[PDB]
Amino acid sequence: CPLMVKVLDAVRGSPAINVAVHVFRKAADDTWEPFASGKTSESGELHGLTTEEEFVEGIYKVEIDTKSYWKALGISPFHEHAEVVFTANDSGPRRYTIAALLSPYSYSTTAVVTN
Amino acid sequence: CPLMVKVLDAVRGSPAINVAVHVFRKAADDTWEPFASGKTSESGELHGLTTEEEFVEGIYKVEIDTKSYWKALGISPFHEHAEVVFTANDSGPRRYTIAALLSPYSYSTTAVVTN
Amino acid sequence: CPLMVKVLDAVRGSPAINVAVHVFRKAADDTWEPFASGKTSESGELHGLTTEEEFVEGIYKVEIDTKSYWKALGISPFHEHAEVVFTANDSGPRRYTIAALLSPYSYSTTAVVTN
Amino acid sequence: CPLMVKVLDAVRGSPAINVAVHVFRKAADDTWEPFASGKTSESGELHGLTTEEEFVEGIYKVEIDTKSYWKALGISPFHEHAEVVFTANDSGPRRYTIAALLSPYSYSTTAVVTN
Ligand SMILES: Oc1cccc(-c2nnc(S)o2)c1
Ligand SMILES: Oc1cccc(-c2nnc(S)o2)c1
């Protein structure tokens, strides 16, 4: 599992469950092509997006569908989605966890890059 | 001044000065088109992006060019940029401040929305 | 105005108004003694806490009364308060803004420190 | 394990390793008495602070020694420590994870309360 996404809810103090997440890779013509996707588990985690073989160096966009999450809880949100855009590069045996902490009008995102 | 962006540096505890910021508005054809751009001042603020006339209802994306910012300080950061996507003026005209707090592997963003 | 506190509400996307804030300074005997207090304004800011004369070198604690804030909005939050502890003016006099962004189970705090 | 602490470093994008953490419980005379302590692991986690039997309802303070962490990396920090103060209350079968995301001039803390 070289790329994992973890989302927390800062209003309810809990994992953010069932948040849709879409990942794109930037293509040579500069458009974003679908790469992988899923919904966060009861733990607020999404595992199994990709494999070491298919996660080559390149520029990726991870879109976390925050707006639908807040709307399924009855809470008016600000953002359409949270977006995390980064270049993945080999520089040894790396695992990438993209963490996001959500509030209706605010989010933070951090990358934890290990091994 | 219906749209303002403010950026702070979480490493230095200071405003993030001279940060490039590009705003796009989603077009009829589902495309991001250029809306406005500028650079943060010595206070870390960017004023004068638009006017209440121009700033109609729409889906906007504010792209904050964080990787260029960190690179110019000798830091190789995780993200290419911070992107903030939101529907604006859909409940009538409002005033929007988009704040971002930056660290090399992390950022947060909040919107303060007032009448 | 060498010490200012600013508080935003991450649920509403607005300044956090009427938030009580108590500042203490560590005494000779290792005790926290009262230094200054106030409430945030309609802008979410608290000005006029101290003067450059009074605001000497020292270890300060800024206690932001977040639980009272959330309770008055009908939210039962996690934290009793947000506490921000720091050494001040130890490199000579500076200007300190202590910002906090609040959610019911989460907060962030940053200091912006200028000459 | 009803109380767990997890700390991330937002400048290096990694767990914050070997951060000292002290937990206090508020006593009837209103002073903080030592309750539990440890240092975060290679995963940035601290497990085994307490047991269900000894973690009764009450007010607790978790102090994360951020200043020493930044000083062992060569980075001038703002805060003396990060403090998380909260009331623990039974309301079913609860586990408390206190998460903190550190930058030199800024931190966030969230509580994830599960089961
Ligand atoms: O900790 C934060 C998070 C978001 C915005 C701010 C902030 N904005 N202006 C000031 S001053 O501080 C501080
Ligand atoms: O206080 C925060 C803010 C953003 C992310 C987190 C976090 N906690 N665990 C992970 S993984 O990420 C904690």
Author numbering:
A (entry chain A), B (entry chain B), C (entry chain B), D (entry chain A): 10 to 124
Question: Mind quoting what the paper says about this structure?
Answer:
Transthyretin (TTR) is a homotetrameric serum and cerebrospinal fluid protein that transports thyroxine (T4) and retinol by binding to retinol binding protein. Rate-limiting tetramer dissociation and rapid monomer misfolding and disassembly of TTR lead to amyloid fibril formation in different tissues causing various amyloid diseases. In the quaternary structure, the TTR monomers are arranged into dimer-of-dimers configuration and form a β-sheet rich, homotetrameric structure. X-ray studies of TTR show two funnel-shaped binding sites for T4, each defined by a dimer-dimer interface.
The compound C1 binds in the reverse mode by orienting hydroxyl group into the inner cavity. Interestingly, unlike the previous studies the interactions, conformations and the binding positions in both sites were different. Thr119-Thr119’ in both T4 sites have a flip of rotamer compared to native TTR structure, allowing the formation of direct hydrogen bonds with the hydroxyl group of C1 but only in AC site. The hydroxyl oxygen atom of C1 make another hydrogen bond with the hydroxyl group of Ser117- Ser117′ in AC site. In BD site same oxygen of C1 makes a polar interaction with main chain nitrogen of Thr119-Thr119′, besides engaging Ser117-Ser117′ through a hydrogen bond. As a consequence of the conformational difference, the ligand has fewer van der Waals interactions in BD site as compared to AC site. Disordered electron density of the entire ligand in the BD site further indicates compromised interactions, which is a consequence of intrinsic negative cooperativity of two binding sites. Out of the reported ligands, C1 has intermediate IC50 value. It has oxadiazol ring with mercapto group in place of the second aryl ring.
